[PDB]
Amino acid sequence: GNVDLVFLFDGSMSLQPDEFQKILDFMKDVMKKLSNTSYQFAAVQFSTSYKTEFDFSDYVKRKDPDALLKHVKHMLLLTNTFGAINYVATEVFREELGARPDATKVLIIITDGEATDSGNIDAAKDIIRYIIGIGKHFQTKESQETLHKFASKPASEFVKILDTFEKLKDLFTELQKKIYVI
Amino acid sequence: GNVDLVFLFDGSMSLQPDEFQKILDFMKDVMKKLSNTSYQFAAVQFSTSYKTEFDFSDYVKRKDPDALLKHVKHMLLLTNTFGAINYVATEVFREELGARPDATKVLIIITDGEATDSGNIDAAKDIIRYIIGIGKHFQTKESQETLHKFASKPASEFVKILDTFEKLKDLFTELQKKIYVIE
Ligand SMILES: [Cl-]
Ligand SMILES: [Cl-]
Ligand SMILES: [Mn+2]
Ligand SMILES: [Mn+2]
């Protein structure tokens, strides 16, 4: 059926220009591969606060990813992941913003550090959540574990730990192996 | 005889990751085709500032283009072309870094926008300079003309204007047609 997918991407101070761009490129990669399908997208940048870079309606209006993400400006602040996920659940997955009531909601969270806030993401639990943790800040098993609470279960399936930003291309190569005409 | 060639590549903010990658791929194709010859290479990324990604010595120690360029990080800043060329002439073409004294010096400058700086490139005049301007920013003849000052003469020979980054593939195809075993 229809799938409404939101890319919630980290725009923290830790990110170097090329790493940030690499996060954005993975997003573009997935979009252009899934162009003209039942998939519809929205992208939200999060750091201390949040910004819907383009919503579902924007996407359908002009499906071009490079264009849709042209005005993105790296926030360079903190990593308030709990608030960010809640913002997506209540402020992005909305009909007035182009979300289809029927669609399966999917969230792809991309981050390079532990959340700088706390609370709960109860309001977003019906959304299928994937989280990609990248870089040195996720060197230890402990840091990696902290991400499980944001993603769907099992974590072995929904949580992806990447050692480098370059590995995003690797991740894209693998996700494509899972594309099928059904 | 021996040829010391430096690729001076644009790492400005305008470039999309795949566009930057195409510039890198062109460089790798040229290097691979010219492996085990009298050519030795060095690569320098320029934007607001410069970074010798690998020097002649690095190339001699390890010829693998992929390995040599694997640590390149897109700068995503300005386009100080005058400063970059001067940097190549005075900080890259040096025996200290593997350059061969009486080798023919060649520079292949690749860019997608007009220079954000000014001055002169007198320090680099004895280097055979080629320049490839790519994309939307070189739509007008006026913009293409601003690149003449950086390249050797005639411009008809040293200045290449490409409308797309995909066109770098055709350029590689063209240059290969000029490859000969010189007697
Ligand atoms: Cl951070
Ligand atoms: Cl630029
Ligand atoms: Mn961070
Ligand atoms: Mn540029």
CATH number of B1-183: 3.40.50.410
Contact: B76, A18; criterion CB under 8 Å = yes
**What CATH class is the domain A1-182?**
alpha beta
What torsion do the CA atoms of A43, A45, A49, A55 make, to the nearest 10 degrees? -20
CB contact A16 to B (< 8 Å): yes
Angle at A25 between CA A136 and CA A164, to 5 degrees: 20
Query: What was the structure determination method?
Result: X-ray
Asked if residues B109 and B150 have their Cβ atoms less than 8 Å apart, the reply is yes
Distance from CA of A86 to the nearest CA of B (A): 31
Instruction: Enter the tokens of residue B66.
Output: 């992929």
What torsion do the CA atoms of B136, B140, B145, B150 make, to the nearest 10 degrees? -10
Give the integer Cα–Cα distance in Å for B129 and A60: 46
CB contact B71 to A (< 8 Å): no
Distance from CA of A78 to the nearest CA of B (A): 22
Closest CA to B139 of B170, B109, B162, B165: B162
Residues within 5 A (CB) of ion ligand 4: B 12, 14, 112-113
Tell me the one-letter amino acid at A26: F
Closest CA to A84 of A16, A7, A28: A7
